[PDB]
Symmetry: C3
Amino acid sequence: GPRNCRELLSQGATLSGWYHLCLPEGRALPVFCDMDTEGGGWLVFQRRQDGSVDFFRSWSSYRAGFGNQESEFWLGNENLHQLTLQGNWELRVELEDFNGNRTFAHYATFRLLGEVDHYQLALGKFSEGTAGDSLSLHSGRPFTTYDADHDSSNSNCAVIVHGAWWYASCYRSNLNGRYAVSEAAAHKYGIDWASGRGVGHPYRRVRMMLR
Amino acid sequence: GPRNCRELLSQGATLSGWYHLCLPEGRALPVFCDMDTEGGGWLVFQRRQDGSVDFFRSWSSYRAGFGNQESEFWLGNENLHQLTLQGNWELRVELEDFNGNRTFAHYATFRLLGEVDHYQLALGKFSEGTAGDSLSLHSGRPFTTYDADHDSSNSNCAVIVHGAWWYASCYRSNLNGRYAVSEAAAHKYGIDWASGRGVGHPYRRVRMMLR
Amino acid sequence: GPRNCRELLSQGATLSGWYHLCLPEGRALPVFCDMDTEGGGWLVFQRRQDGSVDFFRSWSSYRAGFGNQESEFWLGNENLHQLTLQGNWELRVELEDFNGNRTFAHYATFRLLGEVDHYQLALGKFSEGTAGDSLSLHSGRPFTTYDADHDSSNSNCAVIVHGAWWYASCYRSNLNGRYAVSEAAAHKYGIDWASGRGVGHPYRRVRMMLR
Ligand SMILES: [Ca+2]
Ligand SMILES: [Ca+2]
Ligand SMILES: [Ca+2]
């Protein structure tokens, strides 16, 4: 089958939805392709919109992916590593506050290193975005989870901020953070983007996507 | 190798959802099959429900289709043309107002001619429906978008009414029109069925279905 | 094709949703796999919520399955019989009252006999469950619908209680029973589990699943 969402689109798959990709190692993977936004051809690998899915999960869970196709999910670190082995994939982050105001952030490339290197983030340069840049700090850093502490803190940031991310100590972004249904409900550390609304001021809806 | 939704149902696909058809041309086509309404086997080729998708699109977009399997879409004029080359597909239109009342219109056949003929509508007679007949006028007319005006107006109906359709000068129905959440938000030209709620009094939800 | 949901999970299908299984007879079957609950790998064959789907159906409807991938459904007695002829399927029932209290029941095995045997329930022992046992009484009984009365009563239990089930002199469980949006607007007989909330006190959400 197809290697990515751009190729599905070219062959006339014009509706956003769940499609199979054939990974380089010859394995099939269900992914959500956004065929509509910004030209289309985006592979959505993370999505937050209602708090129905628990994102405070272990190393194996984040490695393999988890969640619901109808709602919230993380595609999986190993899938992201395999997809990003070859090709150049731009990252688009989409964020929406409780007022429906949408902001964005675009990076030239996105790649994850392998499990041996703790799925370390290799991020390209920030090109444009109304949300601003809150991911560059995390470039070069290992992913850490509650049961796999690899950060640069003398504590475990996954536990501290209740998430999983390429933590330093701890973050400028935490998009896999704990869901809050409004503001009054907001956590001390939530689904935050520092240079957008700042730490402790979360978003209602989030997507991360590659093309 | 299934060619439509009734075929799928015959083979035991009894739950409404997204399936793949195979076009006579050798292309796989995700479609929504309604497997219950009036015996089931309906291919839904247009849906509106929340205003999340922009429907003011070019000739090319409408030709190839656009939208979101999870929400609102147009399956695409070339797809509809290829589906309807042979066989005779009945058309059912479903309409839901802001109160939640549902009305309907049924036509004996629905077929689109090729792109060479501007995806001209060929429509059978209205048979019955509580919505009334607001499509007959459009039978025998070419499709029109903002960048390809084939209508019977001195101006471009698609631009005037902000939609795409088999426009005359301009319409009795406009189901690809601009979304409105209420009818306080209603545009002068919206998602309209003239014999139902009238021009300028839109519907919250719409589907167009063949079989 | 894969034989069950745990085999899919095993192969990297970690997001809950609709996958195809391939039955002994080679017939591909769309099913919902829950890839999370109790470690994931559950095939959900029944789901109630909202009440958008009519569950008062014929023998042949229950045989074939009906409903909506998006919402409520019954997968099909014939499907279940086919799945369940090669063995070891634990049953898990999930119940949710009108505020959001979830209850459960587990049975070691679940199997449906063929049509000639009226899709008779063959149920293993009740292992544990906060909802208590309400299905042990229906084990060994034939399925019945309004147009096929096989029950242990001088009356027609499917019509009397407005559902379809392996009724005895009717039920200790009535999960395919009529939907109540609230109590307030409950039913003498509804989506009930006697050892739980009890007859006349329905649930809002329900799933029946196999692993
Ligand atoms: Ca640390
Ligand atoms: Ca004109
Ligand atoms: Ca009887």
